[PDB]
Amino acid sequence: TKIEIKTSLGSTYHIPDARRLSWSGDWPELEQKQLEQLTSEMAKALSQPD
Amino acid sequence: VRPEPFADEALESYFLRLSQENGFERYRIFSGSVQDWLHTTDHAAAGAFPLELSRLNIFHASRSSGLRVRALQLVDRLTDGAPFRLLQLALCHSAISFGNHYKAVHRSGVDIPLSFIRVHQIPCCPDCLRESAYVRQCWHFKPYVGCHRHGGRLIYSCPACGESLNYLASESINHCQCGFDLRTAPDEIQLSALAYGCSFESSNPLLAIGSLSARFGALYWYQQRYLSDHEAVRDDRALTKAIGHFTAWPDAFWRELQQMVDDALVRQTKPLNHTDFVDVFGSVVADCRQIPMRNTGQNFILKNLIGFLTDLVARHPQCRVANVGDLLLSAVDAATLLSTSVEQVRRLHHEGFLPLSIVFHLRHVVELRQARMQ
Amino acid sequence: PEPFADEALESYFLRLSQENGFERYRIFSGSVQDWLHTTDHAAAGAFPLELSRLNIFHASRSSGLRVRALQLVDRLTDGAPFRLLQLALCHSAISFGNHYKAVHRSGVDIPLSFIRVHQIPCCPDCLRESAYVRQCWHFKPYVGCHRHGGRLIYSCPACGESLNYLASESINHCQCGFDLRTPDEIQLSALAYGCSFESSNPLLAIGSLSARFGALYWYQQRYLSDHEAVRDDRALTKAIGHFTAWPDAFWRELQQMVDDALVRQTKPLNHTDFVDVFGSVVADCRQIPMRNTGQNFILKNLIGFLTDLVARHPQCRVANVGDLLLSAVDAATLLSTSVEQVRRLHHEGFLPLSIRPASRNTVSPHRAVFHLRHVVELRQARMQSHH
Amino acid sequence: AACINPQKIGAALQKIDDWWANDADLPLRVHEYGANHEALTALRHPATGQ
């Protein structure tokens, strides 16, 4: 299963294979990183208006 | 396609050996394959089998252990030639943890208090690894300092170079990541190394108990009362401290108890008959519940406390002024010293064996014990 | 008179009266009851004279007052507060299964039904050495004796006149009779007075006496369904042979009824009650009074079996054995814990509930609701101990 | 065309409640009473004060 995400701020994220990511555990490299980047955009969406 | 099984090894070690014998290069590749295989027959079981080695063991799982066990059984079944359950190779939560005495894990008949389980580094022994390279179970228990074979002194936590050893973390049996071959290169430490198999010779010390679960119980009590670790990490202190304590015991136990109650008299500001048993004795009675055996022949700590208490009261009979022996005990405390239940104590009050002080006096309990319970 | 280590309470008292010369009825009434009355009125009011009536397990509610009377004797006879109380038979605090009455004597509890209330026999070969009615005769499961050449306890009709020592209180001779100085399995059945065994291969050959008693009670209801014919010796004599192949026979008895039940099936198995197949064999495990697995060997074998049964029948599209429903009181028995603990275990989510109840209602302990395979797995996973 | 309902997608996203009983397990769908549909129970029952 491949998952692709686009946002209104111009970002694109790519998980080449979604079958291996657990609730608890350390994600493989380059994937852990996109989790941080997506977390940041959403952290703003949830907290600052307009 | 199974390898030789051994009776003394950890579950994690078995799995590493098992995967390697099938041409898998790394654990992550093997476990990847297994987790996917399971999705062909039972999806809930599959969701219960993690990919990383460090969390493979059962004791790690809180409410999903049910499914985890099932998953292990499916592995046994699908791998050919399976006369032996792997369930005999791993830790489970033990039933004695109710009431929060302490947490403990069970393995094939022995309960191990949880605090004695190693976590971050794993020692090993080269004179055993050259003969057969697999990890022994006993190496996970803190008390086991020193090998009981091959001289065995001074077992390391760091093989060579700049790195400590942890075989689960680096996934490797013979070599560490800097490439050192782990297999290449006081006298009393043995008194603890033998916890491996007990196997003691007849001797004077109190720790001459043949029940392994009780031997651990005894070590835990000692650590909890004397080697408090307010100030330090206890790598092996027990080897020089516990052996003596349980050897000078005919006196050492009485001196401590005798001092404690005399010391109590010095500070006895209040009229003694309103003072609790615990106010003087510091709950040493409750601690007697930490040893897993209830019969007198194994629980020597309680046995010696009764000795002491009997003579303590016996030197202090009833008079016009509150004195030793007029301390108060609950029905739960009397029940503990009397080796009975609470309702039975209530019955003993109700039938007139002993009176209520408002709740029982220590003299009442020792006298009732000597008088009716032999 | 000093007590014997194995003496009955009534024997000691009879000897005491006689030793002081208080041989006749009237002085037995007197030297006993009137003296007690004159100490205090309660020691007598609680004290009927007839010998059978004197023991605690014959008594009603006012036991403490009867005890006070024992305590007066303890002073008069230069004793100790529990010198007599170690000998008396009292009400057990333990039900011994199915609310049965059971009787407690200093550590051993014996079910009410095994008390030989009438026709106490005797063994002349020991009575000639120390004449006092001894304990371990009052037991139903006890014919013959250890030592003395064995043979039979000389039974009630000594000489055309039924005998006992309570309606006629003499030891060497009784009523019209004289001084009584008058098949190789029962000497094993005899060992309810003590155990004393070595090379105990059978599962009935080890342990404390209370367990040894419970095992026999269980055997009897289950295989001696024939109405009592006071074959007190012969009926129980066979139980030992029965257990000699137990480790391999009990399972077949259980297997037989899985198949006979299966062919009579009327509903899909996942809505079938556990009880419909196994016939309460689980509840019977409660007749031995001990709770833990290492001592209650009947329960230990039943669990062994059920674990294997589940293991050879994994989950698939069509329901099968192992999906049967248990009630709350059944899990409590298999899990070696009290019922309230199961409710707590449910509340924390360690196990699922399979039947949806109606609103504004409650599920009672007798309702069948957990799957067998779920209980077997949970127990292996988090209920083990050093027992 | 075949579809998945809005709230069915939503129920999956917000399943991130594992703050009870000091035992993480798997997370619950956020609910004022801590409902657990699989086991037919409730983790934050009013009786607990949680």
Q: What is the DSSP string of B47-60?
A: TT--SSGGG-SGGG
- Residue D36 forms contact with C (CB below 8 Å): yes
Angle between helix B249-266 and B300-314 (nearest 10): 50
Distances (CA, A) of B46 to B64, B82, C374: 12, 21, 17
Q: Which residues pair with B141 in a beta bridge?
A: B117
List of residues 6+ apart from C379 with CB closer than 8 A: C303, C334, C335
User: Which residue of chain B comes nearest to C350, CA vs CA?
Assistant: B63
What is the CB neighbour count within 10 angstroms for residue D41?
16
Q: Closest by alpha carbon to C69, among C24, C30, C22, C37? A: C37
Beta carbon pairs, B and D, within 8 Å: 7
Asked if residue B58 lies in contact with residue B91, where contact means CB atoms within 8 angstroms, the answer is yes
Q: Which residues pair with B360 in a beta bridge?
A: B329
Query: For chain D, how many helices (H) and strands (E)?
Result: 1, 2
User: CB distance A22–B50 less than 8 Å?
Assistant: yes
User: CB distance B42–C80 less than 8 Å?
Assistant: no
Question: Helices (DSSP H) in chain A: which residue ranges?
Answer: 32-47
CA angle B283, B285, B290 (to 5 degrees): 100
Q: Closest by alpha carbon to B140, among B6, B12, B291? A: B12
Gap from A23 CA to chain D (nearest CA, Å): 8
Contacts of D27 in chain A (CB under 8 A): 23
Q: Closest by alpha carbon to C209, among C79, C111, C282? A: C111
Contacts of B64 in chain D (CB under 8 A): 25-26
Give the span between the Cα atoms of B257 and C296, in whole angstroms.
39
Contacts of B52 in chain A (CB under 8 A): 25
Contacts of A22 in chain B (CB under 8 A): 50-51
- Residue A25 forms contact with D (CB below 8 Å): no
Gap from D32 CA to chain B (nearest CA, Å): 22
Q: Edge to edge, what strands does the sheet with B104-107 contain?
A: B92-93, B104-107, B110-113
- Residue B205 forms contact with A (CB below 8 Å): no
List of residues 6+ apart from B219 with CB closer than 8 A: B116, B143, B195, B238, B242
Resolution of this deposited model, Å: 4.0
| Residues in chain B after which the chain is broken, C→N over 2.5 Å | 185, 358
D21 → closest Cβ in C346, C348, C356: C348
User: Which residue of chain D comes nearest to C348, CA vs CA?
Assistant: D43
Give the span between the Cα atoms of B28 and B279, in whole angstroms.
57
User: Which residue of chain A comes nearest to D18, CA vs CA?
Assistant: A23
Interchain touch C–B (≥3 Cβ pairs closer than 8 Å) = yes
Identify how the structure was determined: cryo-EM
User: CB distance B50–A20 less than 8 Å?
Assistant: no
Contacts of B65 in chain C (CB under 8 A): 381-382
Q: Which residues pair with C162 in a beta bridge?
A: C157
Q: Which residues pair with B163 in a beta bridge?
A: B160
Give the span between the Cα atoms of B302 and B294, in whole angstroms.
9
Gap from A20 CA to chain B (nearest CA, Å): 9
Asked if residue C330 lies in contact with residue C282, where contact means CB atoms within 8 angstroms, the answer is yes
- Residue C347 forms contact with D (CB below 8 Å): yes
Half-sphere exposure of C159 (CA within 13 A, CB side): 10
Give the span between the Cα atoms of C68 and B55, in whole angstroms.
65
Q: Which residues pair with B160 in a beta bridge?
A: B163
Hey, what are B300's tokens?
Answer: 């020597």
Interface test with B, best of A1, A17, A22 (most B CBs within 10 A): A22
CA angle B325, B328, B330 (to 5 degrees): 130
Q: What is the dihedral of CA C44, C46, C47, C51, to 10 degrees?
A: 180
**How many residues are present in chain D?**
50
- Residue A23 forms contact with D (CB below 8 Å): yes
Beta carbon pairs, B and C, within 8 Å: 64
Asked if residue B235 lies in contact with residue B255, where contact means CB atoms within 8 angstroms, the answer is no
List of residues 6+ apart from B350 with CB closer than 8 A: C64
User: CB distance D23–B64 less than 8 Å?
Assistant: no
Contacts of C353 in chain D (CB under 8 A): 39-41
**How many residues are present in chain C?**
387
Hey, what are B60's tokens?
Answer: 């790690």
Give the span between the Cα atoms of C270 and C371, in whole angstroms.
8
User: CB distance D43–C349 less than 8 Å?
Assistant: yes
Contacts of B32 in chain A (CB under 8 A): 20
**3-class SS of residue C122:** strand
User: CB distance A24–D27 less than 8 Å?
Assistant: no
List of residues 6+ apart from B311 with CB closer than 8 A: none
Question: Helices (DSSP H) in chain C: which residue ranges?
Answer: 9-19, 25-29, 35-39, 41-45, 63-76, 124-127, 186-189, 209-223, 234-237, 239-242, 250-262, 274-278, 297-311, 328-334, 339-347, 372-382
Give the span between the Cα atoms of C120 and C140, in whole angstroms.
10
Query: For chain A, how many helices (H) and strands (E)?
Result: 1, 2
Q: Closest by alpha carbon to B275, among B212, B323, B345? A: B323
Interface test with B, best of C382, C383, C387 (most B CBs within 10 A): C382
Give the span between the Cα atoms of B19 and B29, in whole angstroms.
9
Gap from D14 CA to chain C (nearest CA, Å): 21
Give the span between the Cα atoms of B198 and C202, in whole angstroms.
30
Cα B84 to chain centroid, rounded? 27
Give the span between the Cα atoms of C179 and C267, in whole angstroms.
71
Interchain touch A–C (≥3 Cβ pairs closer than 8 Å) = no
Asked if residue B13 lies in contact with residue B19, where contact means CB atoms within 8 angstroms, the answer is no
